[PDB]
């Protein structure tokens, strides 16, 4: 770590994985904190130079900031901050929409005792407040509008035993485009999953049980593949959603 370029690379890869994935990916808690702190300090910095340039100007009708080696640096600061803010905004709003889509599923996950998935890790605190408030508001709306005139036998908005399941869950077999990066950093011999093939670079192997077949993914090729069989590789950064 301790590299501002890698923070931006990680944010971009997280955003790209977020847009194309069906599920609700875990929240990178530390990266967001570091980026927000960096933005907070940087805005203060540009504000400081702006104030310093403004105050001296009015004092004794001095010349403005001399144009050479002056305007372009500060303009670059502003545009860079603008781009970074846009990227984070798009990431946050996309994940908020995905939270909206899967409210009942997340509630059922949180209510289950024997579930390793917990909302304290998968959901940010502000996202927790959003989920709780939106669920209550929607429940109030539906209860006032429709559900009050219904028999006590069926008055639940979540019914897993009815004719049609009322709790929607993510599609675990959606087809996605992936690119095979290989090892996240290097040391191709270190990775145990890598296995060499004939007259070619080492390729990963996966199995499709419903089809009952073995599929080999060669490094440097783009594939259209099921999402479930590639979850571990994406979690370990071996593959990247395009």
Residues 39-68 that bind another protein (CB under 8 A): 39-40, 42-43, 45, 49-50, 54, 61, 63-64, 67
The answer for residues whose C-beta is within 8 angstroms of residue 235's C-beta and 6 or more apart is: none
Region of 147-155, 159-167, 187-195, 203-211 interacting with another protein (CB under 8 A): 203-211
Measured from the CB of residue 169, what is the shortest distance to another protein in angstroms?
15
Count of residues interacting with another protein (CB under 8 A): 77
Region of 107-115, 158-166, 197-205, 214-222 interacting with another protein (CB under 8 A): 214-222
Residues 77-96 that bind another protein (CB under 8 A): 77-86, 88-90, 92-94, 96
**Alpha-carbon distance 40 to 68, whole Å?**
28
Contact between 122 and another protein (CB under 8 A)?
Answer: no
Contact between 135 and another protein (CB under 8 A)?
Answer: no
Contact between 232 and another protein (CB under 8 A)?
Answer: no
Long-range contacts: 36-44, Cβ < 8 Å, 24+?
A: 38/4, 38/7, 39/81, 39/84, 39/85, 42/77, 42/81, 43/81
């Amino acid at each position: 770590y301790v590299s501002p370029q890698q923070d931006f690379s990680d944010l971009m890869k997280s955003w790209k994985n977020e847009r194309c994935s069906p599920e609700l990916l875990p929240y990178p808690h530390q990266l967001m904190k570091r980026l927000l702190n960096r933005i907070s300090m940087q805005s203060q910095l540009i504000e400081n130079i702006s104030m310093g340039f403004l105050d001296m100007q009015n004092a004794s009708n001095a010349n403005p900031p001399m144009p050479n080696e002056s305007k372009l640096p500060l303009l670059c600061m502003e545009t860079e901050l603008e781009r970074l803010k846009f990227v984070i905004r798009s990431y946050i709003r996309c994940r908020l929409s995905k939270i909206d889509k899967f409210s009942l599923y997340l509630r059922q996950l949180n209510e289950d005792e024997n579930s390793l998935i917990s909302l304290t890790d998968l959901l940010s605190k502000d996202e927790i407040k959003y989920h709780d408030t939106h669920s209550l508001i929607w429940l109030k709306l539906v209860n006032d509008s429709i559900l009050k005139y219904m028999p006590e036998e069926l008055q639940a908005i979540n019914d897993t035993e009815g004719s049609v399941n009322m709790i929607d869950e993510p599609d675990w077999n959606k087809f996605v485009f992936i690119h095979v990066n290989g090892p996240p950093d290097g040391k191709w011999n270190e990775d145990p999953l890598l296995q060499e093939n004939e007259f070619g670079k080492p390729c990963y192997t996966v199995t499709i049980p419903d089809l009952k077949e073995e599929v080999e993914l060669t490094i440097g090729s783009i594939y259209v593949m099921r999402y479930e069989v590639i979850r571990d590789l994406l979690r370990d950064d071996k593959v990247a959603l395009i």
